[PDB]
């Protein structure tokens, strides 16, 4: 029940804990783009931070709904982030699809920063995930990888 919910705090890059700022910094440098002060980063409670003050952040709790027939995945909190499982994302991309994948990978235990940028950590996690589940390990999230992520993170699905 509780293992399908991803809770934590949303920070802006300027407000984020320094360990999170450095992770985001290195992530943006890998995709050769500059981080901006208003970049959102979601830090799950499972993440090991020594001296994190939640006051600078905003609490959020995410769950996943995968509509197989509609080929869509919805990330649910107070807001609803929906993406098409026909979209292909890979290292270098940034946006809501990347965020959705990061949230799902984090629920399955992968260590990726949830900042909407597909850098090296996301790539490694995707390859690992693909190897674990018998998918081609090309590091690209396409239809087959979205489907597997969706089935594993939506509790109503087998
Ligand atoms: N890894 C992809 C394979 C299809 C694709 O877009 N390749 O570039 C998937 O998960 O379907």
TrEMBL record:
Which domain of life, per UniProt?
Answer: Bacteria
Residue intervals of the Putative peptidoglycan-binding domain: 2-64
Q: Which UniProt keywords apply?
A: Signal
| Entry's transmembrane regions | none
Provide the Peptidoglycan binding-like domain boundaries: 94-149
Protein name listed in UniProt: Peptidoglycan-binding/hydrolysing protein
Counting on the full-length protein, the chain here runs from 43 to 200 of 200
């Amino acid at each position: 029940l509780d293992s399908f919910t991803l809770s934590g705090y949303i920070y802006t890059y300027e407000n984020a804990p320094q360990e999170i700022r450095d992770e985001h910094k290195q992530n943006c440098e890998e995709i050769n783009i500059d981080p901006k002060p208003d970049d959102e980063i979601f830090v799950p409670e499972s993440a090991n931070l020594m001296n994190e003050d939640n006051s600078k952040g905003v609490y959020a709790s995410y769950t996943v709904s995968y509509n197989i027939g509609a080929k869509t995945i919805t990330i649910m909190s107070n807001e609803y982030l929906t993406i098409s499982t026909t979209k292909v994302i890979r290292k270098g991309n940034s946006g809501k699809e990347v965020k959705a994948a990061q949230i799902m990978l984090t629920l399955l235990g992968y260590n990726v920063g949830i900042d909407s940028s597909f850098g090296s950590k996301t790539y490694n996690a995707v390859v690992s995930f693909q190897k674990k589940y018998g998918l081609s390990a090309d590091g690209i999230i396409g239809p087959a990888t979205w489907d597997k992520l969706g089935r594993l993170t939506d509790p109503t699905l087998s």
